[PDB]
Design a protein around this ligand. Structure first.
Ligand code: FES
Ligand SMILES: [K+]
Ligand SMILES: [K+]
Ligand SMILES: [K+]
Ligand SMILES: [K+]
Ligand SMILES: [K+]
Ligand SMILES: [K+]
Ligand SMILES: [K+]
Ligand SMILES: [K+]
Ligand SMILES: [K+]
Ligand SMILES: [K+]
Ligand SMILES: [K+]
Ligand SMILES: [Mg+2]
Ligand SMILES: [Mg+2]
Ligand SMILES: [Mg+2]
Ligand SMILES: [Mg+2]
Ligand SMILES: [Mg+2]
Ligand SMILES: [Mg+2]
Ligand SMILES: [Mg+2]
Ligand SMILES: [Mg+2]
Ligand SMILES: [Mg+2]
Ligand SMILES: [Mg+2]
Ligand SMILES: [Mg+2]
Ligand SMILES: [Mg+2]
Ligand SMILES: [Mg+2]
Ligand SMILES: [Mg+2]
Ligand SMILES: [Mg+2]
Ligand SMILES: [Mg+2]
Ligand SMILES: [Mg+2]
Ligand SMILES: [Mg+2]
Ligand SMILES: [Mg+2]
Ligand SMILES: [Mg+2]
Ligand SMILES: [Mg+2]
Ligand SMILES: [Mg+2]
Ligand SMILES: [Mg+2]
Ligand SMILES: [Mg+2]
Ligand SMILES: [Mg+2]
Ligand SMILES: [Mg+2]
Lengths: 170, 108, 216
RNA sequence: AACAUAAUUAAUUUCUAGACAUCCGUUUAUGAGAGGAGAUAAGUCGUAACAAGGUAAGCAUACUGGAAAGUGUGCUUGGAAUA
RNA sequence: AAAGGUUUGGUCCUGGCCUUAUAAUUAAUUAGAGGUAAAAUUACACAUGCAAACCUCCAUAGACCGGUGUAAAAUCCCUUAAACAUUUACUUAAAAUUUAAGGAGAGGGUAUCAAGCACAUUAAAAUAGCUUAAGACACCUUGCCUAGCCACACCCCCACGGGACUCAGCAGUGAUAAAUAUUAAGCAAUAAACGAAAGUUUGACUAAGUUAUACCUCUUAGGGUUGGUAAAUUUCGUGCCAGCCACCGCGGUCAUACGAUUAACCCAAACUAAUUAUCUUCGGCGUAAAACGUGUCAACUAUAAAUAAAUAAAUAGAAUUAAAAUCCAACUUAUAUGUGAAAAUUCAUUGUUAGGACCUAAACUCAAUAACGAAAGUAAUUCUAGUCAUUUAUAAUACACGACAGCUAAGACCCAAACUGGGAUUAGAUACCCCACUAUGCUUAGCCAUAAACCUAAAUAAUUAAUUAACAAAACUAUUUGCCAGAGAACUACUAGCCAUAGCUUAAAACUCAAAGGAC
């Protein structure tokens, strides 16, 4: 049995379900939440379930969490321009908190798709090379082309050993 | 252990694989120094043929000679291999029959 | 890290080596000396190419001509036998400055500056002359300067535009139709912007390398 | 130690010279001689433990003894407990 | 891992070892031919030949290619700036390739390497800081990041200098090693260098030679095995011998286990042996390895409540005393004492005292009680001081404690008692039993820091059903820390700290074994 409570949180599939990919402006997200209370239940669930997913998709964003420092829970984002975006998450479900931050400071689906395509621009199917980078190592693999001499011996007249003998014979 | 304790320690530390009589090498070449008999620890009863050899590394070891009858003498050259002789305690080397001075067992 | 220790000897060697080079720089009289019997340079023991043997015995170096002239021939015109044979149009340098090698016992090695007129076309500024140590130079006489320097330019006949390569022309015309541009104009390359100098055109002596001072 | 010549094309020269030698230490090998552990394995002297093992056993500690061990003090049951 | 063999008289649990799969190197035995890939003991010393030129002189190139794995925890990934020993463009910009200063994160081993010792900041020049159990520092080992990268180039990290003065370029040799390719051909292709160019050059490379190391196509057949795990034995010989096994094991006269035969089995141009590598923590801690002798304070990780205490033996101090001893005195038996029975011891004894002294030592009944305290520990009586609120769990390298025994100095001393002496017993009796008497148990100061310090149960908050390995003490979830990783060697060696000096805490390896261990 996987240790801890809700061990599904420690699976790559769960971490990849996060949908909040912050814009490049976002640099820090401080989380102020209270461990005891009734109006902070969604905030506690947000730290338990959602903070891992956010960090997984935003590795370069500093997430620092402070406990029981204020009467109410809130989220404050620090942007590269110097702006500070304060969010109040009291009486809000953990799902509601995720949706709010996605709207205000989350990249749109269109932007993310464009970045994905740009990443793969330099992979070409026609390119030949090692398996790590290319589909086929050699043109011998292609159908109709002359096969590899190791797998299929070449005709004698196509061999340097034979041609050299003729040149000596001439 | 807790997940915090597994994190602070990481994977189990692995003791290093200490080498044996051949020092992690398939074979060694040695010069015979003495030929003697060793008695197998009970419950077995025999006069097992062994020899002391000076290995190429420079150390000296005791090597069991397998087969029925050997012509080995002092100053001969032999190729030793690994493998302990189960009844003979401390004998962790064996001589290879058919290499250098040691020869194949004479078939009867 | 912090175990990458300093290397005092390496730094000392670099500086010391560089200093010795400046102190013991060779001179033109030594680097470009020649043994005419073997046509081999004593400094490095480099034998000149075979195609240069005839001229090394039959032609003069630039400062051999200039050492015999007042003011080292400032203002005089000098041409090269290679140019005289290759180009019908006048090719010459108009000498402006000349720094002889005082060390030479005949003042036959040095540097020069002047204004180039190649194939009848004259440059606008003076620059250092290359290949001054070559056995190829011919001083122009003062009385023959007017006839030598007389040149009338012919109208340029080298094509200014050419067709595009067969495939590259089809790719251009195909793009026109795709973009809606309808025309039967033939794509044409413009060669005026990228016209090549002759292969023997004088090069920039200022940016050229000099041989080292270690004898072979 | 870093200036001085030169200057009616302009350049020359300086742009240095000692001392970077020992180290204080730090590891490893050698081992006079003195010990330990284990195995070889027919023995010797006792019978300490396992039965209430014939004085229940053991722990810490002290002293004592051919040898296991003995005795004291507190503690444990991984002993017993009706006459 | 779809697992298997092996602890026992037997079963169950726990747990190590080994087997079955895969690949490389070497060795034994054995092999035809062809195609392909790869070639590898050694940063050891190198005989000879070659590996860099080109070209109208100047220049450019010889900084590459090729080689090795030297050094170094060395790096990976990323940011910034700047040039470039360049290219191609412009009189001003696109690249390729580098260099310098850095840092989100990641990055080998040993903590018996626990402290490093200037490792910081400010900018009147003062302040006293910086790194480190979230692993500094020290030491050891290693090429990694793999379309490739990094370091090295005879040695002295460097290379002015000095020295033991160059193949870690191709082929080749010496020595060494278990480890064994041609002192070969050509610049025709591609790549590089040079030239404006026709072209020239190249041990890069191309095409060959060599080699069962691998793959592929064919042809021949050899190699090992045959007790179990694990596919497969006939007969004889041997007789605990000769030999055999990876593990368990086999051989003392009917050996399916050895040797030779016979027949079968497996793989097959190979086959078997040795060596090496490939598999790697969500499991446990009453009885099997494992909860620390005890408590308190930090930083994290978790948790969420707002109290506690409220005269039964905590602790410390002072005072106090009932019973039984001891001493002294009076009287007094002739013996007293002691054992299963004796002996020695003793008559300086013995018994009585409603006689005196003593205040040493220890606290019956209550106690069939289950309180107090962190634990250790604490119960004769009285008085004084005194336990109490941090939400909760979680601490060492700090602090304060810690039975008994023991050490140090000065006292106490009723009784008990190691040692010692005397007496018995016994084959002996350095013991058990008897008698005597010390250290010691007591007080006051200090040390020592160990217990089967064991409820053999870490603490805390839940649950009692959607739950029998065995036994013990019903099962089980969550949180945090500690601890464990076969047995012995080993409460050991070395290291460091300590009032400890025949000490305590900390705590390995070689080597040996195939088990050890728990419950029934
Ligand atoms: S791998 Fe393509 S010819 Fe061999
Ligand atoms: K046997
Ligand atoms: K006993
Ligand atoms: K006994
Ligand atoms: K007993
Ligand atoms: K097993
Ligand atoms: K070096
Ligand atoms: K070529
Ligand atoms: K028989
Ligand atoms: K057999
Ligand atoms: K057989
Ligand atoms: K107990
Ligand atoms: Mg030229
Ligand atoms: Mg007994
Ligand atoms: Mg007895
Ligand atoms: Mg004891
Ligand atoms: Mg005694
Ligand atoms: Mg006694
Ligand atoms: Mg071989
Ligand atoms: Mg290379
Ligand atoms: Mg190395
Ligand atoms: Mg040590
Ligand atoms: Mg060097
Ligand atoms: Mg060498
Ligand atoms: Mg060399
Ligand atoms: Mg070589
Ligand atoms: Mg080989
Ligand atoms: Mg070119
Ligand atoms: Mg056999
Ligand atoms: Mg067998
Ligand atoms: Mg235990
Ligand atoms: Mg006695
Ligand atoms: Mg006394
Ligand atoms: Mg202890
Ligand atoms: Mg106790
Ligand atoms: Mg102890
Ligand atoms: Mg000790
Ligand atoms: Mg010690």
């Amino acid at each position: 049995p996987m240790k801890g409570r809700f061990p599904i949180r420690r699976t790559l599939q769960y971490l990849g379900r996060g949908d909040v990919v912050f814009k490049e402006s976002v640099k820090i997200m401080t989380v102020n939440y209270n461990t005891y209370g009734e109006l902070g239940e969604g905030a506690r669930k947000f730290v338990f379930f959602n903070i891992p997913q956010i960090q997984y998709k935003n590795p370069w964003v500093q997430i620092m969490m402070f406990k029981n420092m204020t009467p109410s829970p809130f989220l404050r984002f620090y942007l590269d321009s110097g702006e500070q975006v304060l969010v109040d998450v009291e009486t809000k479900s953990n799902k509601e908190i995720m949706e709010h931050i996605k709207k205000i400071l989350g990249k749109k689906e269109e932007t993310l798709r464009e970045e994905e395509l740009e990443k793969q621009q330099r992979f070409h199917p026609g390119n030949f090379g090692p398996r790590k980078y290319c589909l086929r190592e050699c043109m011998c693999e292609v159908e109709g082309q002359v096969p590899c001499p190791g797998l299929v011996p070449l005709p004698k007249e196509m061999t340097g050993k034979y041609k050299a003998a003729l040149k000596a014979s001439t | 252990a807790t997940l915090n304790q597994m994190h602070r320690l990481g994977p189990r530390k692995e003791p290093p694989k200490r080498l044996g009589p051949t020092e992690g090498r398939p074979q060694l070449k040695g010069v015979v120094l003495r030929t003697f008999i060793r008695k197998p620890k009970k419950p077995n009863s025999a006069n097992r043929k062994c020899c002391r050899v000076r290995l190429s590394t420079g150390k000296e070891a005791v090597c069991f000679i397998p087969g029925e009858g050997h012509t080995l003498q002092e100053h001969h050259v032999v190729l030793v291999e690994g493998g302990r002789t189960q009844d003979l305690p401390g004998v962790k080397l064996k001589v290879v029959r058919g290499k250098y001075d040691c020869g194949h067992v004479q078939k009867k | 890290r912090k175990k990458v220790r300093p290397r005092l000897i390496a730094e000392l060697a670099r500086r010391v080596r560089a200093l010795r080079e400046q102190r013991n720089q060779p001179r033109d009289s030594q680097l470009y000396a020649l043994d005419y019997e073997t046509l081999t340079r004593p400094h490095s023991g480099r034998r000149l190419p075979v195609r240069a043997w005839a001229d090394v015995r039959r032609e003069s170096r630039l400062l051999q001509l200039l050492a015999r002239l007042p003011l080292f021939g400032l203002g005089r015109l000098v041409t090269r036998k290679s140019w005289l044979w290759q180009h019908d149009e006048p090719c010459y340098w108009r000498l402006t400055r000349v720094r002889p090698d005082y060390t030479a016992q005949n003042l036959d090695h040095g540097r020069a500056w002047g204004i180039l007129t190649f194939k009848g076309k004259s440059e606008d500024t003076a620059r250092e002359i290359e290949q001054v140590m070559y056995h190829d130079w011919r001083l122009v006489p003062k009385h023959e300067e007017e006839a030598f320097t007389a040149f009338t330019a012919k109208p340029e006949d080298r094509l200014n535009s050419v067709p595009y390569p067969p495939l590259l022309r089809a790719m251009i015309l195909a793009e026109r139709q795709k973009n809606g541009d309808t025309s039967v104009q033939e794509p044409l390359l413009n060669l005026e912007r990228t016209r090549m100098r002759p292969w023997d055109y004088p090069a920039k002596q200022e940016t050229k390398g000099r041989a080292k001072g270690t004898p072979v």
